[PDB]
PDB file of C-alpha atoms in Angstrom:
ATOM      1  CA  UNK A   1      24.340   0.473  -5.384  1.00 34.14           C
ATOM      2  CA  UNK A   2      23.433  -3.150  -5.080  1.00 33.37           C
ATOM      3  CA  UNK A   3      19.894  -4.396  -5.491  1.00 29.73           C
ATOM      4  CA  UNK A   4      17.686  -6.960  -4.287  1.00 27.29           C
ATOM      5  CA  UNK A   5      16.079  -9.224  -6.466  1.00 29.70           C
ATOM      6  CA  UNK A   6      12.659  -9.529  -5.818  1.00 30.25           C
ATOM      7  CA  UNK A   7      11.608 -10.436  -9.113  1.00 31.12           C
ATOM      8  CA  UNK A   8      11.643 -10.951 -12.923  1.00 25.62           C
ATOM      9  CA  UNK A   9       9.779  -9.073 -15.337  1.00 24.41           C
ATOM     10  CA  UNK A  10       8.096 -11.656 -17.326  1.00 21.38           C
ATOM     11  CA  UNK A  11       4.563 -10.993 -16.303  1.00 18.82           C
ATOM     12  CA  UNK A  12       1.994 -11.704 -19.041  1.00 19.77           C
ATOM     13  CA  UNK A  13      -1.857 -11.436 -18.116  1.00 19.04           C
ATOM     14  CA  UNK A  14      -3.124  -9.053 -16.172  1.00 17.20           C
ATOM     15  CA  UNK A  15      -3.200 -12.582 -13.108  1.00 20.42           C
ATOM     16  CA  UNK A  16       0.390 -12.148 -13.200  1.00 23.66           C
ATOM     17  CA  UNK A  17       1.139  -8.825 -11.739  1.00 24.23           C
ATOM     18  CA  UNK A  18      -1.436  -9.477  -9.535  1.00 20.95           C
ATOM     19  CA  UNK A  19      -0.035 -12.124  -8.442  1.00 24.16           C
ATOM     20  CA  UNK A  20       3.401 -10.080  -7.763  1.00 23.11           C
ATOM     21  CA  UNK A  21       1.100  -7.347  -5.786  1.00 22.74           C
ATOM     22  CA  UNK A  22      -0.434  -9.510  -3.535  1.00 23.67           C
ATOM     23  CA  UNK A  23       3.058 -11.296  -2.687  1.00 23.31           C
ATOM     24  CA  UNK A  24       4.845  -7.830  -2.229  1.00 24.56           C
ATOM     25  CA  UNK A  25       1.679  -6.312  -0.762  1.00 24.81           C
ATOM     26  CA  UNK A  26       1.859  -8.847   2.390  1.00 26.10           C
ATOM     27  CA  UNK A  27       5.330  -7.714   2.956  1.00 27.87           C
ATOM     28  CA  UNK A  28       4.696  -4.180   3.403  1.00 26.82           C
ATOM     29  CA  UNK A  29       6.143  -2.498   6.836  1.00 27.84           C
ATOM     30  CA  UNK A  30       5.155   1.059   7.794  1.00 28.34           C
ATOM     31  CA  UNK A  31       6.600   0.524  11.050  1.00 26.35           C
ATOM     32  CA  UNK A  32       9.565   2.283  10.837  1.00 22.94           C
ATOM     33  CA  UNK A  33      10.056   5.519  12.312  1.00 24.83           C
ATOM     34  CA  UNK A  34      13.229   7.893  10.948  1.00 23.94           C
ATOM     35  CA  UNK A  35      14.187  11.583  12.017  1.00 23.08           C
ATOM     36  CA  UNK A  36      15.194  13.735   9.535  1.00 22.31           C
ATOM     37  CA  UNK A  37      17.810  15.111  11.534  1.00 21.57           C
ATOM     38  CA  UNK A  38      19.313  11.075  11.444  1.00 21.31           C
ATOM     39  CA  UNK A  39      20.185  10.469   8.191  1.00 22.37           C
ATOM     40  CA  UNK A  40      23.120  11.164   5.869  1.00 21.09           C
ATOM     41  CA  UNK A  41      21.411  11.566   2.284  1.00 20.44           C
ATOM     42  CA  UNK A  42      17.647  11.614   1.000  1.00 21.06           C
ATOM     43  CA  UNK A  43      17.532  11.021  -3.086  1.00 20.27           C
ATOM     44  CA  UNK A  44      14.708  11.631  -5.844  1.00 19.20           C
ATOM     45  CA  UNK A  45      13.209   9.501  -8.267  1.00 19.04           C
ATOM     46  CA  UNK A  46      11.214  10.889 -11.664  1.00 18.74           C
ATOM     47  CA  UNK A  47      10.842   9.023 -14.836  1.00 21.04           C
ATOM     48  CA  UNK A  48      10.006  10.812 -18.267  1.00 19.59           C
ATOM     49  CA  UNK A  49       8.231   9.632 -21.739  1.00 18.64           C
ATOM     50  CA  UNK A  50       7.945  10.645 -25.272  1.00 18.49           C
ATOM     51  CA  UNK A  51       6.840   9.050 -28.688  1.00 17.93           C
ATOM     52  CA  UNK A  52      10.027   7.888 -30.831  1.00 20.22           C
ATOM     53  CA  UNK A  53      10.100   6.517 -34.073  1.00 20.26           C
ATOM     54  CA  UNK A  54       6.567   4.699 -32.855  1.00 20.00           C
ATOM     55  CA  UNK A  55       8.188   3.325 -29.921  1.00 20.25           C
ATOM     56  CA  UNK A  56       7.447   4.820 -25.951  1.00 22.38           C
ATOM     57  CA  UNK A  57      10.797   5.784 -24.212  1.00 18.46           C
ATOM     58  CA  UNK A  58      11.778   6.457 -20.624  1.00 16.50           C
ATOM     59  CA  UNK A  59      13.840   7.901 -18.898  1.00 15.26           C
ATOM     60  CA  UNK A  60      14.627   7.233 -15.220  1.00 14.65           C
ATOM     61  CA  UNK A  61      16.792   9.854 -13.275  1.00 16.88           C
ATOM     62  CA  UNK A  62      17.866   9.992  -9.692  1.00 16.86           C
ATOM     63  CA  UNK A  63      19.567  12.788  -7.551  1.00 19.49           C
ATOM     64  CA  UNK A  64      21.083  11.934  -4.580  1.00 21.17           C
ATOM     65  CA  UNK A  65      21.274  15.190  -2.173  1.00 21.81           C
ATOM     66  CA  UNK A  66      23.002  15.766   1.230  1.00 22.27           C
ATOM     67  CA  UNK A  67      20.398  15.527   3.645  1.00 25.15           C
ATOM     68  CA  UNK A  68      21.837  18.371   6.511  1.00 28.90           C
ATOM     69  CA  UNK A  69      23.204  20.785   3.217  1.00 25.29           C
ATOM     70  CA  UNK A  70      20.542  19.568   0.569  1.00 25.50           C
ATOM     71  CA  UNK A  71      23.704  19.983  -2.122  1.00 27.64           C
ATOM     72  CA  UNK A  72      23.470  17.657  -5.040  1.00 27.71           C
ATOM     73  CA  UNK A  73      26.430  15.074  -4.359  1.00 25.08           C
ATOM     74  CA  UNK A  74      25.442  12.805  -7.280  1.00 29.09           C
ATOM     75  CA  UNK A  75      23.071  12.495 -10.537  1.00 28.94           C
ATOM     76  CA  UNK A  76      22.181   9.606 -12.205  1.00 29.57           C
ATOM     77  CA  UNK A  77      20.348   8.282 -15.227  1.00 28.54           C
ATOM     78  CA  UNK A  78      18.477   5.475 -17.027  1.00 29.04           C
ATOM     79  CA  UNK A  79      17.373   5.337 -20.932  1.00 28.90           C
ATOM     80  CA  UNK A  80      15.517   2.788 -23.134  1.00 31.28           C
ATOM     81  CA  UNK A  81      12.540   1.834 -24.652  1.00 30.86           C
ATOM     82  CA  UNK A  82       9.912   1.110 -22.375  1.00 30.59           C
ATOM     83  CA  UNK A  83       7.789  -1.536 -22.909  1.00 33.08           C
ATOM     84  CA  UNK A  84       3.827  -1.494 -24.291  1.00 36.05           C
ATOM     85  CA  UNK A  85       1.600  -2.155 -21.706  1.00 36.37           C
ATOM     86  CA  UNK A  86      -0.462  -5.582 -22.609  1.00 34.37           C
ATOM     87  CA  UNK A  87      -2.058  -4.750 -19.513  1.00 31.61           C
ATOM     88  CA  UNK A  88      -3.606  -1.566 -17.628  1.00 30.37           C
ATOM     89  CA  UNK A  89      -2.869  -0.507 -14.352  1.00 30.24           C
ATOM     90  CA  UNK A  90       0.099  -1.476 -13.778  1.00 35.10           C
ATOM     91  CA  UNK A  91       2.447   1.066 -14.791  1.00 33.69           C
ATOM     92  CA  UNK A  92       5.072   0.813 -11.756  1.00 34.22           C
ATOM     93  CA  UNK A  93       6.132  -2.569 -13.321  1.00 37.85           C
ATOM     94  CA  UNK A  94       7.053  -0.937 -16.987  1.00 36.31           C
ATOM     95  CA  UNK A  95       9.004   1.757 -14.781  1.00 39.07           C
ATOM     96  CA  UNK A  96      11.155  -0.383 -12.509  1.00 39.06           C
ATOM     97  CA  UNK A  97      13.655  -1.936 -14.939  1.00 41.94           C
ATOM     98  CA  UNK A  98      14.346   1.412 -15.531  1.00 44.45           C
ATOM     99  CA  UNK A  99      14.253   2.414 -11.805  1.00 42.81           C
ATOM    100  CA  UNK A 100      16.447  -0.701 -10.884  1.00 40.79           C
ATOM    101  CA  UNK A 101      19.194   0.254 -13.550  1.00 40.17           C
ATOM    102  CA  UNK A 102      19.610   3.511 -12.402  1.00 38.86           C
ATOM    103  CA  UNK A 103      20.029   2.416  -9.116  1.00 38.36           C
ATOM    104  CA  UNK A 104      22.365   0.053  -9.941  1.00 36.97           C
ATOM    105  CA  UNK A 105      24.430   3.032 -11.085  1.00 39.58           C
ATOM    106  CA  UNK A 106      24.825   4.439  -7.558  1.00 38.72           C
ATOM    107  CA  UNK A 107      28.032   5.457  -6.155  1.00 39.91           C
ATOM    108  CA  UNK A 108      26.420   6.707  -2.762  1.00 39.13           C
ATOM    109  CA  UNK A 109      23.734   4.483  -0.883  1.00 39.01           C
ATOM    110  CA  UNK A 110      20.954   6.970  -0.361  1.00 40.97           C
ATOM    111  CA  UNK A 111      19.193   6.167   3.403  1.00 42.06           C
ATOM    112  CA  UNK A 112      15.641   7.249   1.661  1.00 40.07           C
ATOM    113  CA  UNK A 113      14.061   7.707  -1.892  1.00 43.14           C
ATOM    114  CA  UNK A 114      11.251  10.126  -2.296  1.00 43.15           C
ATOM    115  CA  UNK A 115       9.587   9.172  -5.442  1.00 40.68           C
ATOM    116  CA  UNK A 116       7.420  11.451  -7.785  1.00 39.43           C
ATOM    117  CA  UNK A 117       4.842   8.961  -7.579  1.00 41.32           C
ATOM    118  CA  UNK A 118       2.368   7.000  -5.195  1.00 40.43           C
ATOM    119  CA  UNK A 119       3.134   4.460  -2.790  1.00 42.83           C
ATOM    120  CA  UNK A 120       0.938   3.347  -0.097  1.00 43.60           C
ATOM    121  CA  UNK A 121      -1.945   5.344  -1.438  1.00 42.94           C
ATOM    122  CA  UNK A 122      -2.763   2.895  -4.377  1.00 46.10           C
ATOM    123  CA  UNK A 123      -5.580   0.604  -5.400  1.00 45.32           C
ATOM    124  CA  UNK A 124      -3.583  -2.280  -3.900  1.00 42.24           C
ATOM    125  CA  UNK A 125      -1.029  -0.082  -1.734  1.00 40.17           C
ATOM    126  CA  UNK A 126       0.946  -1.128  -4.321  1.00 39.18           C
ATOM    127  CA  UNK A 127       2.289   1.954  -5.806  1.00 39.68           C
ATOM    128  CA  UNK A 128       5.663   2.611  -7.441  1.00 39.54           C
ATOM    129  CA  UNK A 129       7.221   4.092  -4.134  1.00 38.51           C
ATOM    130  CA  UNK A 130       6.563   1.300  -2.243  1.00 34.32           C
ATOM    131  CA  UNK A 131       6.950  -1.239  -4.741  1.00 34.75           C
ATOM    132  CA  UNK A 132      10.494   0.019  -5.954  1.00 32.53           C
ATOM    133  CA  UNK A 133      11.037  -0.174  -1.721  1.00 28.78           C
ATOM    134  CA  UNK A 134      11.314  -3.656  -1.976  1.00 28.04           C
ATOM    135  CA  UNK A 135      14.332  -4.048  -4.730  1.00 28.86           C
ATOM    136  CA  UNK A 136      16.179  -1.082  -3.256  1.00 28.72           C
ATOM    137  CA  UNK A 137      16.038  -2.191   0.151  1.00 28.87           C
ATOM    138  CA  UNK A 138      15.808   1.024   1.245  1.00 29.07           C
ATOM    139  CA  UNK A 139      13.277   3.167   2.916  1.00 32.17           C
ATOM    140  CA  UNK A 140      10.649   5.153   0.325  1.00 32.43           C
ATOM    141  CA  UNK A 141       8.620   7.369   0.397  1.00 31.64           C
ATOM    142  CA  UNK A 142       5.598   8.451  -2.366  1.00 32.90           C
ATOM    143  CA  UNK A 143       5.002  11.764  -3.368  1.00 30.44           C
ATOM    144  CA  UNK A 144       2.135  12.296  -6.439  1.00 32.89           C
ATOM    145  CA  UNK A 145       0.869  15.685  -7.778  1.00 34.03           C
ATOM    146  CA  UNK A 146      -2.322  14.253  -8.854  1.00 37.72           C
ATOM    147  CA  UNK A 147      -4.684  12.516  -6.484  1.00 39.87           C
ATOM    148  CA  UNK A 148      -5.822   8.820  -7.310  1.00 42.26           C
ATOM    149  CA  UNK A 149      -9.399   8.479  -6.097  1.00 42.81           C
ATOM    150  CA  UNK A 150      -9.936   5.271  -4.748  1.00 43.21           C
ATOM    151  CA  UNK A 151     -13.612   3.348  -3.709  1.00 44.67           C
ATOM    152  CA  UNK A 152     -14.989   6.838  -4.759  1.00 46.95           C
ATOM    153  CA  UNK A 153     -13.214   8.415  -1.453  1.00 45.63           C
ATOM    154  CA  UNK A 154     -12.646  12.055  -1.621  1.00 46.10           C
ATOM    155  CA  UNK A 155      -9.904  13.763   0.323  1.00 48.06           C
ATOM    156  CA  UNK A 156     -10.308  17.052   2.329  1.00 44.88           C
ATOM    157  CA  UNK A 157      -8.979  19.861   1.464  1.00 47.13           C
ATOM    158  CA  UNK A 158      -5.751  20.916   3.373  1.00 49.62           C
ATOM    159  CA  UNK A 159      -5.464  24.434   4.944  1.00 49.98           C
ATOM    160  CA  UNK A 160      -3.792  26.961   2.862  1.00 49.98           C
ATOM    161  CA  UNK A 161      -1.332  27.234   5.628  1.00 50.62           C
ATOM    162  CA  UNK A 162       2.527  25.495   4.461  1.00 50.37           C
ATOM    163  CA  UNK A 163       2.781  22.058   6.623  1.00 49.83           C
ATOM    164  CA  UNK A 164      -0.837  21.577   6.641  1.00 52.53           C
ATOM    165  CA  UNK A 165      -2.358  18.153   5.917  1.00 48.63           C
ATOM    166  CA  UNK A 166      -5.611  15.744   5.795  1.00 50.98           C
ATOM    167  CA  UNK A 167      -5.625  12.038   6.461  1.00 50.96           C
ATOM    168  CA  UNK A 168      -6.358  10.310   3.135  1.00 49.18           C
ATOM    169  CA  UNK A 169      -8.999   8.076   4.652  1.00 47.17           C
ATOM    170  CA  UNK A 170     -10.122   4.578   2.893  1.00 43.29           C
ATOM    171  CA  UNK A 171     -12.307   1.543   4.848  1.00 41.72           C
ATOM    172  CA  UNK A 172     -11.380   2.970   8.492  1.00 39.66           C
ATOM    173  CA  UNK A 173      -7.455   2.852   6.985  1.00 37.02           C
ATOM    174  CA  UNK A 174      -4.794   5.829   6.076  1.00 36.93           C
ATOM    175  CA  UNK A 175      -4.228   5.619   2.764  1.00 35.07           C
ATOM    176  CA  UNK A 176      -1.751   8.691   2.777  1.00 38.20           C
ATOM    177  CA  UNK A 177      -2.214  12.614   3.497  1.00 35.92           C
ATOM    178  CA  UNK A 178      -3.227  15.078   1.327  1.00 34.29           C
ATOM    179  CA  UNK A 179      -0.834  17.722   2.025  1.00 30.87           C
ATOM    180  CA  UNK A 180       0.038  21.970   1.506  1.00 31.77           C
ATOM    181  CA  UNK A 181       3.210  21.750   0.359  1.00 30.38           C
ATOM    182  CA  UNK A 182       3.411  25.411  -0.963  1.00 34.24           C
ATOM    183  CA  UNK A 183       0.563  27.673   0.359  1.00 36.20           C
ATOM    184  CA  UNK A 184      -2.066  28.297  -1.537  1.00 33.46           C
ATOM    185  CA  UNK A 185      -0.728  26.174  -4.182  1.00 33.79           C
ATOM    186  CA  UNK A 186      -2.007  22.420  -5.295  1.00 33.28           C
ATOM    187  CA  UNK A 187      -1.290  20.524  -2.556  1.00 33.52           C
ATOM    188  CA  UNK A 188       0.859  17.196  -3.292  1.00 29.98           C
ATOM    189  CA  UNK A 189      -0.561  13.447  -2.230  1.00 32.32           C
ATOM    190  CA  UNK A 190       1.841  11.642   0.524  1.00 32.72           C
ATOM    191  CA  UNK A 191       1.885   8.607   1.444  1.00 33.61           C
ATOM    192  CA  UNK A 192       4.407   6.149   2.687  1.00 36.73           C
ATOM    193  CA  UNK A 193       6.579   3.812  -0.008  1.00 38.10           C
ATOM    194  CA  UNK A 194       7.792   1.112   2.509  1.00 39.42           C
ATOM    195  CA  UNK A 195       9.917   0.993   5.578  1.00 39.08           C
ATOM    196  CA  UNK A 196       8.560   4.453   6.928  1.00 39.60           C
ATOM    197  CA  UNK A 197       5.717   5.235   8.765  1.00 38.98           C
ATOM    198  CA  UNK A 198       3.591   8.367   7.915  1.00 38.36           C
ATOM    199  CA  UNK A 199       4.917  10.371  10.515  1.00 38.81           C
ATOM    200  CA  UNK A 200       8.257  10.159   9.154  1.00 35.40           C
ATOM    201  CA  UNK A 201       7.207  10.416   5.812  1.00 36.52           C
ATOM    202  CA  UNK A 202       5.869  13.786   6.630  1.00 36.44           C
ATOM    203  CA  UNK A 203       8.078  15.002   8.409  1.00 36.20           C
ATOM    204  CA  UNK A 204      10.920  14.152   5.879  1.00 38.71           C
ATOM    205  CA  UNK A 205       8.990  15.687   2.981  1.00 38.53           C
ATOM    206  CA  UNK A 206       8.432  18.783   5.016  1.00 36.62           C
ATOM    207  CA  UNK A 207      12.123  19.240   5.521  1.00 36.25           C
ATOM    208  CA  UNK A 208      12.510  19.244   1.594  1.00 37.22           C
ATOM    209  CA  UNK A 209      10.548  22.164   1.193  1.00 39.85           C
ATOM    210  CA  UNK A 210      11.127  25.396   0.327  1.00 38.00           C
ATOM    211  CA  UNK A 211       8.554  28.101  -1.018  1.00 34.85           C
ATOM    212  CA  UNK A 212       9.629  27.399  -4.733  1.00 34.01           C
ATOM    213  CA  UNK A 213       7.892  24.371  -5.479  1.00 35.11           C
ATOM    214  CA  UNK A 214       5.691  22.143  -3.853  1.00 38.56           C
ATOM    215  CA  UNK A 215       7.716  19.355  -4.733  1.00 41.37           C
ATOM    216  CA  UNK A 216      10.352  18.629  -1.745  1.00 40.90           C
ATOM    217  CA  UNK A 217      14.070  19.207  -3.380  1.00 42.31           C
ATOM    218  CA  UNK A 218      14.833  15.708  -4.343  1.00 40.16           C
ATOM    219  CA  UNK A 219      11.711  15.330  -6.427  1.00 38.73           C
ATOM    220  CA  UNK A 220      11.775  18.768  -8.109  1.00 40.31           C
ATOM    221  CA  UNK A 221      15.313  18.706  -9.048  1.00 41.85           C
ATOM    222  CA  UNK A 222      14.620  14.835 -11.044  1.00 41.56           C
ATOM    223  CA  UNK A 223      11.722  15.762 -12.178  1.00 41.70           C
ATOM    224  CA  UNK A 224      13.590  18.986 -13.528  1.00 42.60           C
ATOM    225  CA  UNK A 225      16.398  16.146 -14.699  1.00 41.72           C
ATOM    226  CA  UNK A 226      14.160  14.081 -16.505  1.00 43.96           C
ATOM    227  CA  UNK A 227      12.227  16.441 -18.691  1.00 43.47           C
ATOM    228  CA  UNK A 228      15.861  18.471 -19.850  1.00 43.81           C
ATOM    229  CA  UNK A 229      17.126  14.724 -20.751  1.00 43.87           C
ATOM    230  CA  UNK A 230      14.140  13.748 -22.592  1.00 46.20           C
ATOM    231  CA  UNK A 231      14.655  16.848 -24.848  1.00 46.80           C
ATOM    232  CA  UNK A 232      17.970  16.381 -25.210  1.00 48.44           C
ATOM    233  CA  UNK A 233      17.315  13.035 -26.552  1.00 47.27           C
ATOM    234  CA  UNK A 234      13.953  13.938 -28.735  1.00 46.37           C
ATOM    235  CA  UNK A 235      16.139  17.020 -30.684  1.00 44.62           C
ATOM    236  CA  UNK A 236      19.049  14.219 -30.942  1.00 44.37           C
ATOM    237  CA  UNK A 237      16.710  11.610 -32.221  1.00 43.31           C
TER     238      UNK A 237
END
């Protein structure tokens, strides 16, 4: 599908991308508030690495699911050499070429992408989910299975119970939820990419789950995408 250009990726000090942060940052809309039961499609974004020849790769794939059957109705993928960070901590900028390409190869128009990744509950709310948001044009929504402590903020530990969550709570604000995706399994980190409030975000992700994973379909099945890819590629190196 078509993209939006937001902008180029020619940052070179670490002032640069925070420069593109800040902009983006100001831009952000959690407003939005979107059944589950009213959309069409939902799709998945995971990205993969390995060392090659001395060189990091990547590899961006994206599954597109029906969103009442949860049938895959399209897979698609993005390879290349990803570049060295100069920089630290800004790793959803050396994964969005890759994201954007992908895209790009899009048949369908997916009404939501779950990411396996943070959004909203970032250092600068600026996490891949929501930063991808604004060159898709579509909304996101971030789900991480490690938890990014910010201003030394611990979460709370959600019941054991499936569907159960904590607020993810940061300077009075809500960063995102920790939440029990699978019961008594490692919960996953939610928060909203862009264009979705946390409501929706929840109760989206919750509709992706089934006692298999605690990743909601979309996610597990790209994240299941990537890694066969990348070893495909590494044994055909």
């Amino acid at each position: 599908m078509k993209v939006f250009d937001v902008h180029k990726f020619d940052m070179k000090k670490e002032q640069d991308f925070l420069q593109v942060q800040f902009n983006l940052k100001n831009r952000i809309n959690l407003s939005p508030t979107i059944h589950p039961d009213s959309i069409n499609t939902t799709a998945g974004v995971d990205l993969a690495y390995w060392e090659q020849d001395g060189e990091p790769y990547g590899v961006c794939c994206i599954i597109v699911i029906d969103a009442d059957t949860k049938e895959v109705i399209e897979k698609v993928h993005s390879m290349g050499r990803i570049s060295v960070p100069y920089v630290s901590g800004f790793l959803a900028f050396r994964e969005l070429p890759l994201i954007i390409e992908a895209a790009k190869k899009l048949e369908t128009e997916p009404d939501v992408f779950l990411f396996d990744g943070n959004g909203y509950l970032h250092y600068n709310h600026m996490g891949v989910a929501t930063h991808a948001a604004f060159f898709l044009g579509k909304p996101t929504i971030g789900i991480a299975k490690t938890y990014l402590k910010i201003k030394g903020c611990d979460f709370v530990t959600p019941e054991i119970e499936v569907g159960a969550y904590t607020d993810i709570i940061i300077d009075g604000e809500v960063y995102g939820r920790a939440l029990r995706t699978r019961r008594d399994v490692k919960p996953i980190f939610l928060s909203c990419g862009n264009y979705i409030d946390l409501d929706s975000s929840y109760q989206i992700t919750m509709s992706l789950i089934n006692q298999e994973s605690r990743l909601p379909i979309p996610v597990r099945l790209a994240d299941l995408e990537t890694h066969v890819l990348r070893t495909f590629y590494q044994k055909n190196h």
